């Protein structure tokens, strides 16, 4: 019945282009670090015992289910990490956002190539267009803010569209 351990990503994006970098960290409800951390990848026990696990030049093999647990029985809710290789990737701070919390969308161009005329779509509607790339920053989540999103943009003068992404928002009576 106690507080379970949480996992944070930095940068937020749990979906990234191959060769990109990301870091997993296990909760601050273990501050001075009283217990070694144990990371689990798709199942096996990782050999890193520290509070934060790194990932470099992320290969595809690195995609998967990540979980960390301390010295209790319960283990962090799993965090899924997908590694892609396309022209545009739509990254989100969190796929399921508790009511009220902030949300971030980002149209990310491969090798961080410039993407002009980026447009973000929400349920087939044009949410926001800008001459250049830009992040979608939703300060306070809502109900309308759910639905499936995806972005389009020009990279080196050609047109591209990110594979679509679902975002859900909850309520607490």
């Amino acid at each position: 019945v106690p507080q379970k351990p949480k996992v944070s990503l930095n940068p937020p994006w749990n979906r990234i282009f191959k060769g990109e970098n990301v870091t997993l960290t296990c909760n601050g409800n273990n501050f001075f670090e009283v217990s070694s951390t144990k990371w689990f990848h798709n199942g096996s026990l990782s050999e890193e015992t520290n509070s934060s696990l790194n990932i470099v030049n992320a290969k595809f093999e690195d995609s998967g289910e990540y979980k960390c647990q301390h010295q209790q029985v319960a283990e962090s809710e799993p965090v899924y990490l997908e590694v892609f290789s396309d022209w545009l990737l739509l990254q989100a701070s969190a796929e399921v956002v508790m009511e009220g919390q902030p949300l971030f969308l980002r149209c990310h161009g491969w090798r961080n190539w410039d993407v002009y005329k980026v447009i973000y779509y929400k349920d087939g509607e044009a949410l926001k267009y800008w001459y250049e790339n830009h992040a979608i920053s939703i300060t306070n989540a809502a109900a309308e803010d759910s639905g499936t999103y995806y972005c389009t943009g020009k990279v080196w003068q050609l047109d591209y569209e990110s594979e679509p992404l679902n975002i859900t928002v909850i309520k607490a009576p």
Partner: protein, 217 residues
């Protein structure tokens, strides 16, 4: 030469059609700005002549498009004379979102002026239908390429959406050629046989018009 697409925002400036210029005798050029992004303030479109002589009042519409963008069109009335006499008009758009200003200009096309040659034809019936016959009109060896085709029928200038006219194409004779097609109904040729395929070009005399009659049977 590419300081013409500020922040990516492109613009187009259309030239008066032969028709709107000689028949209708009320020509107008249009400046169309695309890929603008919604904002608090509107753009600042400004029309001007190279001669320095003042300009008529313009029109302006701002249509938020489906793709999140925002368009702006502005049409301007133009003195039929001034234009043919080589005058030159320029469209200058300007908005905060923009670094350099956006400009585009246009004037009467140059070169040698060779009148149009037109020949009208008509198809024979076919086992498929006995009450539908097709018309065709070929206009060639002309220049510039700016041409306005159309049709008449018993003093009635048919609906533009009635015929299909192609785009100019060059010939081994330094002139261009365009084709027109106008499907027809039995009822209409019994009303009369005279079908006219007019043509408006900057050359052709004496009324800048040129036509060739046709008919079945």
């Amino acid at each position: 030469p590419c300081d013409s697409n500020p922040r990516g925002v492109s613009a187009y400036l259309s030239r008066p059609s032969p028709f709107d210029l000689f028949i209708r005798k009320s020509p107008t050029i249009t400046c169309l700005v695309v890929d603008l992004a919604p904002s608090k303030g509107t753009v600042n479109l400004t029309w001007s002549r190279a001669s320095g002589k003042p300009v008529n009042h313009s029109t302006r519409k701002e249509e938020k498009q489906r793709n999140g963008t925002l368009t702006v069109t502005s049409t301007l009335p133009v003195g039929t004379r001034d234009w043919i006499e080589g005058e030159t008009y320029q469209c200058r758009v300007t908005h905060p979102h923009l670094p350099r200003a956006l400009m585009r200009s246009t004037t009467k096309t140059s070169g040698p002026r060779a009148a149009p040659e037109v020949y009208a034809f008509a198809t024979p019936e076919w086992p498929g239908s006995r009450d539908k016959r097709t018309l065709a009109c070929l206009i060639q060896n002309f220049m510039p390429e700016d041409i306005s085709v159309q049709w008449l029928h018993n003093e009635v200038q048919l609906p533009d959406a009635r015929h299909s006219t192609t785009q100019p194409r060059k010939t081994k004779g330094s002139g261009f050629f365009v084709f027109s097609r106008l499907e027809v109904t039995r009822a209409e040729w019994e009303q009369k046989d005279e079908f006219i395929c007019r043509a408006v070009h900057e050359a052709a005399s004496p009324s800048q018009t040129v036509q060739r009659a046709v008919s079945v049977n």
